[model samples]
Every structure is written in C-alpha cells, then in structure tokens.
Target chain A: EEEFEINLSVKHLLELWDKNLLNTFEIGTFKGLSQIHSYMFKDIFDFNGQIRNVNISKNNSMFCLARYLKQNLEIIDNMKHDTFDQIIDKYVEMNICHPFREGNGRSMRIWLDLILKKQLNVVVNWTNINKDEYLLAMINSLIDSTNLKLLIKNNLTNKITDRNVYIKSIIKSYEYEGFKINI
Target chain B: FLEEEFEINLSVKHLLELWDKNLLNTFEIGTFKGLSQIHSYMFKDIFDFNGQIRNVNISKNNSMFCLARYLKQNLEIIDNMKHDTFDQIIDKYVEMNICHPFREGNGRSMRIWLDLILKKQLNVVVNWTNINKDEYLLAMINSLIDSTNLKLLIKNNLTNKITDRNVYIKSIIKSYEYEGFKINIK
Candidate 1:
C-alpha cells in the first residue's frame, strides 16, 4: 500500500543523512578528515558525484561543498595568523565552499563551533542566528578588514543574545588581557 | 601566486618537518610536543628544502593555525585577495622558514587548506594524494605547478557534487581496489 512506500522513503532519507556523515568528501582541516571509505560514501549518498553543472541550484551547493571538503581535508597548518579576523575569514571561506548540497550551512556552523572551541576556546551560538546579517557582514569584511572586526564586535558579539553572553564575556576578558583586535 | 596556495604550502611544510624530527620521541617524553607541534616542525623542514626561505622566526602566536585559517577563507577569496595579498601570505610562509613551524608533515595540512579555499571559491575538489604521492611531493618541491594541475586527480575522480553523488560513492568504492575492502553498504 501507499503506507509502505511513504515509510520507506522516510527511512531512506534518514539513512542518507547518516551515510553522509559516515562517508562524505570534506574540506575541513580537522584530524582524520580523510577516512577514504567514509568520504566516498558521502560522494554517492546524495547523488552528488553524478551530476553535471552542479552550480545550477542549491542542490548543487552540496556537491560543491563536498568537493571543497575533500580538497581541504587535513591540508592546513592553522598556526600562522592568530587573530579573530583570521578565524572569521577562514570560517566564511569554509561555509561558502558549500561542499554538501543539503547540509552546507548546518555542517559549517557545527564545524565553526569546534574551530572556535579549539582556537580560542570560544563558543558560538547558532540558535536563531541571523544568516543574512552574517553574510552581509562577511561581504563587508572581505572588502575592508576593519568591517570584519566591527562585525565581530557588534553583530557577532555574544552580548547580542543570552546564549552568547558567556562567549562575549570570554572575548571581553581576552581583550582586557590585551588580546588586541587589529581591525 | 595566490595567498591560499602559499599559506597551504607553508602550513604543510611546517607540519611535515615537525613529524620527521620528533618521530624518535613519543608524546610522553616530549611533554610540550603534540601532533600540532610535529606537524609544524615537518612543514618547516620542507619549506627550507624548497629553498623558499631560511632563518625564519617562530611567533608567540600560533602562526600555522593563523595561516591555515586565513588560507581556508582564502580558498574563496582568491578572486578578491590581490597578488600583493597573496604575496604577503606567501611571504609569511617563507618567513617562517623551517625551524619555527618544524619541517616534515605539512603535506596533509596543505591539501586540506587548498581544498577548502578552492571548494569555497571555485567549487573545485583537489585530491593530491589520490595520485602518485611522489610526483605530487616533487611538484611541491618546485612550487611551479598550478593548483588545478596538482589537484587534477581529485577533480577527475569527483563528479558534480550534486548529481554524481552516487557515482562519486561508487568511484570511492572503486578506489579501494588496493585497500582490500569492499565498498558495499547494503
């Protein structure tokens, strides 16, 4: 009956997500990023490796992201520029790589959380975050480094939301400790 | 010529150097050493071998992380970050020389850094190790090859990340010919 068909599709979709996590091409620098079998699994799970002109729509964004991810896996030093501006710029680049068509933003946000945690032990709250504002801020930053600093201080500040309050306090404490924000 | 490329190369050089030098010592004995330190050390050695720079200084800041982060963002910003910007990134890598970041394990870091930048900016996937590792390393030694060429193996293997997802999976499965593992998921 129709019930069986519908249920199967739902189950299949969930399987797809797990398969993606277990096996996708990636563009991040975290350790063990190159689990070949897992990456390959991701390559096929969403039909990302079969399409042409993947730039046609958001559907293609995922493919692009994976491609980016595969290329980026464990290929960086990460100890060159130790500043917030450098961190923000890197995050935006990874996010915009749009490797996974279905999970670009979501994966990047989670990755960003980990990145901050690793770098400065900062925690970012993605809950109800303004994607549009963040994008605009990034665009502006790309034009002028100063804008990036301001964006971090203003739009990205933990003070904007209750969830981010703790993050803001940490940043402020860093500042008081003379961690200069060059922009 | 691009900042992302230079950043990546430098990053890789540091990591590789560190690993090679510290291979004799375990983490237990090297109390201040970790994977990150090893990575930087190895990369630094490679950078020196390439004759790109010598006698660079280490920073109080984590220069490798900073460079990696900047290069990651730079993958997409290549079109925007001018030659000067790119040169600065490269200069920074050269400045670090071989000792500050260590010297041998930078290859892996370079690959990932380049991939993120290219994927974000051009939606290109680069698989350097997917090909002959020796040739790829030689290419880096010269610093004369283009990213496109260096990453050709991955690009060739990669289908459109959207439509060829299944095919890409199959391809990856097929890649396991030498690994002795079947790729079936059912």
Candidate 2:
C-alpha cells in the first residue's frame, strides 16, 4: 500500500496543478524544495523546458500544450487504427512528444504496450528491426507523416529473432559483444 | 522499496488464493500516480513481483537493455493468465511477440520466447515443423510494419475462419507473399 499511497499523493498534486493553484504544493514548498516540484512538472511533460507556461497561443500557458498532449495521448493510447500506416503514424507523433520529460521514452513504451494490450490484447514484442525502424521512423516522422510511415513499413517487415532483448545486463553483452561483431 | 510497497511480492500461490475466492482484483496499483510513474508501475504491478532495479544509468545501450527485460517480464505475465489453453495461448503469444521493443533481440527473442511463454503458461508444445513458419513470421512482420498484408491476413484468419486448415494456410501464404503465392504447391 505504500506504493499506492505515494501514487495517490502524487495524484492530489496533479489535480491541484492541473486546476492552476500553484500553492497546492505543500510538502516541498514548506521544505524549501520548490526545485523538486519544478523537476516534477518538467519531467512529467517536456513542456518545451518552460515550466511556468511561456509560449502558447491564446490559451493559458499550459492549457494548449496540455490539452494537445491529452488528446494526442488518447488517440495514440487507443489506437484502433483502420490501417497499419495509422498505427505507425500514431506511434511517431505520441512517442516523440513524450509527455513526461525524464522518463518519456520508458513511459511511452510501457504506455504503448498497455494500450496494445487493452485494445488488441496483443503485446507488441518489437523485434530488432522493429526498434531500429521505429526510432528512424520517429525521426523521419518529424519531417512528415509520409516519411514516417515509410520508416514504419521498413521496421515492421524487417524483424530479427529475439524477445528478451531489454534486460540491462543482457543488452550490454549483446550490444558490445553479440550485435557489433555480427555474431 | 517501490516493489515491496506495490505488493508485487504477492506470490503466485497467494494470487491463486485470491483468484479462488474471487477477491483477486484488490491488488491493482498506479491509478493515482502520474503517467510517468503509472507506466513503470503498470508493468510491475501486475504479477505482485515487487523489487525495483534502480541507480541504473541510461544510454542508447540502456534503452535496448530495458526493452528486452520488459519483453521477458510481460511475456511471462501473459503466460500466467487464467484458463488459457496451450495452443491458443501459444498462438496469441507468438502473434504479439513480434513487436520487439528492444533494438536487437526482438525477432529472435520474440519467436523463441513466444514459444516458451506458451509452453510455460499452458504446457502446450509448438515447433517450427508443426506451424507454418513463414506465415507466422510474415504476419508478425506485417503487423510491426503496419502493412496491407497484415490487415488482409488477420481479417481472413483472426476475425474470420471456419476451423479449416486450407483456409488458414491460404491466409498464411497470403501474408507470406502478399497474395503472390498459394499455400499448396498445386
């Protein structure tokens, strides 16, 4: 329950922050730890590195970006794409924005898997080729959705043959020892 | 500390106890957390397998490593779900196993682990010889790439099939060749 308690406490903070009452931060403010909340806000969503809501058009500083992200996340998370291309497109857009700053990549991945599990009931095992293609596609996607989809196709078809490829130690041995030498 | 707090330590035996009494739903965690922490907890929260791996640094290599670990962990979870048959479970495991989150070990680990998870979860046996290897491989690849072939294949197979081997094989070959070839040599 300790884990849950922390999460619940964080939840109350998110609620307050979302509602726009900066004074809602009680623990850190009292402890002279405003820096911690600063990091927390930025890390949750990149927000373009300006935590105090700087460059938005018309809406409240954080509103436009936060709303855009919320919608994007919903779309990406609930990807019932009529086509595979759509899936790739969604992957690029949402994964790149990475709502959370510090752990965006990891959170996005788990988020990716969760939605897949919820929607398709299938875990996306992301083969070797898939990962390379996905990253490249995300980069390419930044150029255009078409370019992004092309990379997606490239990644989808060119799968390798390993699944337990992400354990830290295992990844190291494989990268330096297993993958580089073509062995 | 995080793992223990999440009650991830709830053993398989204990979980089963909850399952038998229809009180298994109490173990869920992460709803109150932010998306960042929720994501991490979601994976850990499922099996009552607590314990966090922290103080680890990240890099290009670390990302790849983390992806592999995640695949194995989730794969095991799928295997442990209730009332799954060997063959049906294996097929699903194999299907989802293609989405390798890691940079390298994806294809190898997916196919191998799918088979293993299936076996571990349901005690079913699958072999390259028994299943249509190319069909499974191509369909998986198509899904990852988001290809036309994947849609057509799943439409014909996953959503519509009559328990007929010929129909299944036809769909498999369609996936393998994008309908450029036939399942039978005839």
Question: What fraction of correct interface contacts does each candidate retain?
Answer: 0.00, 0.00
Worst 10 residues of 1 chain B by lDDT: B24-33
Tell me the tens digit of each residue's lDDT in model 1 across B1-50. Answer: 47545544454334333322223123311111232333444344434344
* Candidate 1 residue spans exceeding 4 A from truth: A1-81, A127-129, A139-149, A153-183, B1-186
Cα lDDT tens digits, model 2, B30-115, are 11111112223333344322222222322252122234445546544544443255434434433343323332223322332332
Q: Candidate 1 at B181: error in angstroms?
A: 56
Per-residue lDDT over A124-171 for candidate 1, one digit per residue giving the tens place of the 0 to 100 score: 543233445555555554345465455454434232212224333333
- Model no. 2, DockQ: 0.01
Measured by TM-score, the strongest candidate is: 1
Shift of residue A133 alpha carbon in model 2, Å: 5.0
Model 2: per-residue Cα lDDT at residue B153: 40
